[PDB]
RNA sequence: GACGAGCUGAACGCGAAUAUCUCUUUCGCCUUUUACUAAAGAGAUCCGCGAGUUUUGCUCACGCAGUCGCAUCUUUUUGUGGGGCU
């Protein structure tokens, strides 16, 4: 219609925020010797893996936070981690240009996916095919046969580092976000972008799918946008700006969107209304700089009740819902609908 | 109530012969990398191999044919007969 017309529609009909209980940080785990950069939860929900700048992958007990195992095989930072839901496999990528399949029955690297020309930044397992997708500084999403280690496909078109990656079973089966400020939705059968989304002004460092809805969120240093699938229809911006580079985004089944800032902020938003009900800043562990405070990864556990964050003060932090909270004792940041008339 | 030697196909399967490679680690050579050592594992490959009908190539061969739609003395096929009562 217009920006004015749509702004009046928006003042009338914006979905109100669903009340979400606040989250509190209940656990710091020290022990990585570099920035914790990636997290991944195992589908059983009993351990998580964190990769680091100290080049290791640590396996942690999800309920005690206990170091179960350290895995060394990367030469540089571990930048991405993906635990398979269908295979007893963990996948890691790293700044060493290397993608590794870890056999979790051996605790050993059994396959290596060779071919990234620069450091690898993002990883994604196809949820239904035995295929993995990695993006890196060579601006390219490399699509790998899990079994034969073969590079089945190269998704070309981005211009800078592919920083975020999504994989789903419906079309578009790969979503990438890049430092070139675009999101490509890919047709995995054709090897071609099915859509290029140019609404972001900064680089898209975080993508997240909605667990249940056909929609994803992308996050920049400037906005978190929400997009409808298959075609990547812009739904909306979050109703506030985390004034931070967002490194990580996780979405819950309750629709809690967690976004984690390069400055160590953690904002919790209502998916579906776009409204942030919580805003936190990290505390950095003793010794750290407060410059060294970013929030590089976050995942929810499989139930959605825990959020594990991988931080630049080299900690894993764990957050649980203060779910003994009720919309009366704990509403959080309160909502004013987007009443403005603005230009879009 | 009944008949193969040799080749390529079979699609399924590893008597006693065993070499190479890859990966993840440790160990030893030790300036580095190859090229190596010897331990732990996890994976491949090579060179070969057995049976089923597929026949190609016999240079062998066939049909009143080997087989068809237990044979009289006490224990078995040489029965103990005949009558008649409720």
The C-alpha atoms of residue A290 and residue A266 are separated, in whole angstroms, by: 15
- Distance of C1' in B41 from CA in A237, Å: 52
Hey, is A13 helix, strand or coil? helix
CA angle A285, A287, A291 (to 5 degrees): 80
Nucleotide with smallest C1' distance to residue A110 CA: B23
Nucleotide with smallest C1' distance to residue A107 CA: B24
The rounded radius of gyration (Å) of the Cα atoms in chain A is: 19
- Distance of C1' in B7 from CA in A231, Å: 61
Place of tokens 């990367």: A74
Residue A8: which H helix or E strand, with range?
A: helix A3-13
- Walk across the sheet containing A108-113 and list its strands: A78-83, A89-94, A99-103, A108-113
CA–CA distances in Å: residue A61 to residues A34, A85, A238? 20, 18, 33
Place of tokens 């790998």: A144
* Resolved by: cryo-EM
- Distance of C1' in B59 from CA in A36, Å: 81
Q: Which of residues 58-77 of A touch strand B (CB under 7 A)?
A: 72-73
Q: Go through A307-343 and write b for each residue having 16 or more CB atoms within 10 A of its CB, e for each that does not.
A: bbbbbbbbbbbbbebeeebeeeebbbbebebbeeeee
The C-alpha atoms of residue A163 and residue A246 are separated, in whole angstroms, by: 12
Q: What values do phi and psi take at A10, rounded to 5?
A: -75, -40
- Distance of C1' in B61 from CA in A145, Å: 59
CA angle A246, A298, A47 (to 5 degrees): 170
The C-alpha atoms of residue A40 and residue A270 are separated, in whole angstroms, by: 23
Structure tokens at A174: 């790969």
- Distance of C1' in B82 from CA in A125, Å: 106
Q: What values do phi and psi take at A295, rounded to 5?
A: -130, 100
Per-residue flag: A110 CB under 7 A of strand B: yes
Structure tokens at A319: 């957050």
The C-alpha atoms of residue A243 and residue A235 are separated, in whole angstroms, by: 21
The C-alpha atoms of residue A156 and residue A164 are separated, in whole angstroms, by: 15
Q: What values do phi and psi take at A6, rounded to 5?
A: -65, -30
Per-residue flag: A228 CB under 7 A of strand B: no
Q: Give, as ranges, the nucleotides of chain B with any atom within 7 Å of a protein CB.
A: 23-25, 41-42
Interacting residues of A246 by C-beta distance below 8 A, sequence separation 6+:
A205, A206, A219, A220, A221, A224, A259, A260, A261, A262
CB A7 within 8 A of CB A340: yes
Is residue A209 packed enough to be buried (19+ CB in 10 Å), middle (13-18) or exposed (0-12)? middle
Per-residue flag: A243 CB under 7 A of strand B: no
Preceding omega of A205 cis (within 30 degrees of 0): no
CA–CA distances in Å: residue A314 to residues A47, A51, A60, A99, A244? 18, 10, 14, 22, 20
CB A253 within 8 A of CB A211: yes
The C-alpha atoms of residue A158 and residue A80 are separated, in whole angstroms, by: 19
């Amino acid at each position: 219609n217009s920006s004015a017309a749509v702004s009046r529609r928006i003042a009338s009909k914006w979905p109100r925020p669903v009340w979400h209980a606040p989250w509190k940080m209940y656990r710091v785990i020290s022990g990585h010797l570099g920035w914790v950069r990636c997290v991944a939860v195992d589908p059983s929900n009993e351990w998580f893996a964190t990769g680091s700048a100290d080049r290791t992958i640590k396996i942690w007990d999800l309920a005690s936070g206990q170091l179960k195992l350290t895995l060394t095989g990367h030469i540089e930072q571990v930048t991405g981690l993906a635990v398979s839901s269908r295979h007893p496999y963990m996948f890691s990528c790293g700044l060493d240009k290397m993608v590794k399949c870890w056999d979790l029955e051996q605790n050993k690297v059994i396959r290596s996916y060779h071919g990234h020309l620069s450091g690898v930044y993002s990883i994604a397992l196809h949820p239904n095919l035995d295929v993995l997708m990695t993006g890196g500084r060579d601006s390219v999403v490399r699509v790998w046969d899990m079994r034969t280690k073969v590079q089945a496909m190269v998704l070309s078109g981005h211009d800078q580092t592919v920083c975020s990656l999504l994989a789903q079973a419906p079309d578009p089966q790969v979503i990438s976000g890049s430092h070139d400020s675009t999101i490509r939705l890919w047709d995995l059968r054709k090897g071609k972008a099915s859509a290029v989304l140019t609404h972001h002004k900064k680089s898209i460092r975080a993508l997240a799918m909605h667990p249940h809805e056909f929609a994803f969120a992308s996050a920049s240093a400037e906005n978190i946008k929400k997009w409808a699938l298959p075609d990547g229809d812009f739904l909306h911006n979050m109703l506030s700006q985390q004034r931070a580079i967002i490194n990580s985004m996780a979405i819950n089944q309750d629709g809690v969107v967690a976004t984690g800032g390069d400055n160590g902020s953690l904002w919790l938003w209502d998916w579906r209304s776009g409204h942030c009900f919580q805003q936190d800043e990290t505390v950095v562990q003793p010794g750290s700089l407060e410059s060294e405070g970013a929030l590089y990864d976050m995942t929810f556990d499989m139930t959605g009740s825990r959020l594990i964050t991988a931080e630049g003060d080299k900690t894993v932090k764990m957050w649980k819902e203060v779910e003994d909270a009720t919309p009366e004792t704990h509403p959080g940041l309160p909502f004013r609908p987007p009443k403005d008339i603005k230009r879009f």
